[PDB]
Amino acid sequence: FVEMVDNLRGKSGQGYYVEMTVGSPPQTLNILVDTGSSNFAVGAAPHPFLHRYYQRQLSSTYRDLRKGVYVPYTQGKWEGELGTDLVSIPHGPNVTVRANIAAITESDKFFINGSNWEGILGLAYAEIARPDDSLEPFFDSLVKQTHVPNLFSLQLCGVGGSMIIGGIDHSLYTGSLWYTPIRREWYYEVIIVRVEINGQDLKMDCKEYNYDKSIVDSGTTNLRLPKKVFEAAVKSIKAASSTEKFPDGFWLGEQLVCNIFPVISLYLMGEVTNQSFRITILPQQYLRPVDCYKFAISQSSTGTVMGAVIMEGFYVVFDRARKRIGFAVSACHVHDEFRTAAVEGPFVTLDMEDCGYN
Ligand SMILES: C[C@@]1(c2ccc(F)cc2F)C[C@@H](c2cncnc2)SC(N)=N1
């Protein structure tokens, strides 16, 4: 796995990407690593924002599926033509697989002006693949066609990081891994059972923490929280940080600001009945440099999203083989001399199954 260390790059707020090759002869592309979606989709036309794009005409191994796909998001969209081709990861396992590829032929608010990636690698499950679950996601193809173990891990450093494909590199973390069950294989869905701001329980019905889901998503920058939870969390963060006052717009991410800030703890459902563990992040994770900073915790209508704000504190193991996600303190996380991100257990937490939304 030495070869896979430091195989991720990016720019702040623009996501983390890995080098891949598609086609025969191989075409090199930079591809966003996204645990929050399930399609392998790449620019296939000369959009002006793109450094490079997939040219199917140059690939002898390209196969047309003769189906199109339209993928709208809340703001923006991509549309593409489905096919298959041979795909490798130069700084990954020494293998080539035949994968589904959506050739992107038009988009809006999808590619970023100024970024260095030109496609997305959806690492989540078939249930959320577009157009439907018959379109086998890349990782499912990789595990089917090779001996690569059904696991990957991510160390996102606040940019660079590591995607260890088929394993765990113990040099990337300190202490022990602690595992939370994947509730359902669609998104990487998890259950949050308790929330603390500076060790102070938010005291909410834990179902609210997971309304309507809680997910782990490398393709999202922020820690996104259900609005009822966000309102409560902001109230507590405001109170803990009242040495200095800030405009109300800052907490809503409508404006920037230029030890006063509390830690944030999320208790996650453990592996055993009535057992949990907690992960703890610092302001160094949730106040993001733009010295100007954006408040990178925001409300959601789609549930909790544990984006880069959470993942940058931790080495995160997507243990698909055992339907569980592991967290350990990241050897690269940004901290200071007084506080560090933490993963701690075990704790006693009752009625954890009541926390999941149905
Ligand atoms: C595919 C997606 C995504 C990530 C990064 C990006 F640069 C462009 C993207 F399209 C969709 C994003 C999204 C936007 N709006 C409503 N829902 C999801 S979040 C995610 N993890 N992956």
Domains along the chain with CATH numbers: 16-148 (2.40.70.10), 149-358 (2.40.70.10)
- Paired tokens of 59: 């690939």
Mutate to test the pocket of ligand 1, among 37, 74, 116 (most ligand atoms within 8 A of CB): 37
- Method underlying the structure: X-ray
219 alpha carbon to ligand 1 midpoint, in Å?
6
Mutate to test the pocket of ligand 1, among 120, 186, 304 (most ligand atoms within 8 A of CB): 120
Which of left, alpha, beta for 323 (phi over 0: left; psi -120 to 50: alpha)? left
Q: Spell out the residues 6+ positions from residue 18 whose beta carbon is closer than 8 angstroms to its own.
A: 7, 8, 30, 31, 33, 89, 91, 92, 121, 163
* Cis amide leading into 212 (omega within 30): yes
Q: Is the CB of 217 under 6 A from ligand 1?
A: yes
Residue having the nearest C-alpha atom to atom 14 of ligand 1:
73
Is-catalytic flag, 336? no
* Cis amide leading into 25 (omega within 30): yes
Q: Is the CB of 111 under 6 A from ligand 1?
A: no
| Residue type at position 347 | F
Catalytic residue among 6, 108, 169, 217: 217
Is-catalytic flag, 217? yes
> How far from the centroid of its chain's Cα atoms is residue 237's Cα?
24
Nearest-atom number in ligand 1 for the CA of 78 is 10
Q: Is the CB of 303 under 6 A from ligand 1?
A: no
Nearest-atom number in ligand 1 for the CA of 14 is 7
Q: Is the CB of 10 under 6 A from ligand 1?
A: no
Rounded to the nearest 5 degrees, what angle is found at the Cα of 129, between the Cα atoms of 127 and 131? Answer: 115
76 alpha carbon to ligand 1 midpoint, in Å?
9
